[PDB]
Amino acid sequence: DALAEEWKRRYEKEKEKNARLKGKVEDLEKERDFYFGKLRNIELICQENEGENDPVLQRIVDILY
Amino acid sequence: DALAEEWKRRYEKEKEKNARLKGKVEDLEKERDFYFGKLRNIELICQENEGENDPVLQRIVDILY
Ligand SMILES: [Zn+2]
């Protein structure tokens, strides 16, 4: 009766929260992978130019690691 | 009665899910900010060396943007 309706409202409220959290997880994952992909692209650029011995690139490697 | 107990179990289950999603959101946010901070650190390194005209740095700027 009223005790069931009360809990249902709590379930649905918690269920709406779940839906919003699932959407934030998906958005944060895309963002993390996006920035992560850039770091791997830049790491590669640096690895190709290990022969330049550029002290700037070395700074950038330190930040990557 | 039994109808309330059933919904309670659904609320608690959904509530456990919420707790796990909140922890994943916090973990993904830390990771995203971590990688993001590195890109801003590297962007700065590049901006300091705009006078070198290094074509490698230009590659790295393109990846940053
Ligand atoms: Zn040079």
Swiss-Prot record, chains A, B:
It comes from the Eukaryota. Residues 38-60 are annotated as: APC-binding. It is found in: Cytoplasm, Cytoskeleton; Cytoplasm, Cytoskeleton, Microtubule organizing center, Centrosome; Golgi apparatus; Cytoplasm, Cytoskeleton, Spindle. Changing residue 38 to R: Abolished acetylation by KAT2B/PCAF, impairing kinetochore-microtubule interactions during mitosis. Residues 25-29 are annotated as: Interaction with APC. Residues 26-65 are annotated as: DCTN1-binding. Acetylation at Lys-38 by KAT2B/PCAF promotes dynamic kinetochore-microtubule interactions in early mitosis. Crotonylated by KAT5 during mitosis, promoting astral microtubule plasticity and dynamic connection between astral microtubules and the cortex during mitotic chromosome segregation, thereby ensuring accurate spindle positioning in mitosis. Decrotonylated by HDAC3. Ubiquitously expressed. The modification N6-acetyllysine is found at residue 38. Residues 50-65 are annotated as: Interaction with SKA1. Composed of two functionally independent domains. The N-terminal domain forms a hydrophobic cleft involved in microtubule binding and the C-terminal is involved in the formation of mutually exclusive complexes with APC and DCTN1. Belongs to the MAPRE family. Homodimer. Heterodimer with MAPRE3. Interacts with DCTN1, DCTN2, TERF1 and dynein intermediate chain. Interaction with DIAPH1 and DIAPH2. Interacts (via C-terminal residues 206-211) with APC (via C-terminal residues 2674-2843); the interaction inhibits association with and bundling of F-actin. Interacts with CLASP2, DST, KIF2C and STIM1; probably required for their targeting to the growing microtubule plus ends. Interacts with MTUS2; interaction is direct and probably targets MTUS2 to microtubules. Plus-end tracking protein (+TIP) that binds to the plus-end of microtubules and regulates the dynamics of the microtubule cytoskeleton. Recruits other +TIP proteins to microtubules by binding to a conserved Ser-X-Leu-Pro (SXLP) motif in their polypeptide chains. Promotes cytoplasmic microtubule nucleation and elongation. Involved in mitotic spindle positioning by stabilizing microtubules and promoting dynamic connection between astral microtubules and the cortex during mitotic chromosome segregation. This is Microtubule-associated protein RP/EB family member 1. The gene is MAPRE1. The chain holds residues 207 to 247 of 268 of the full protein.
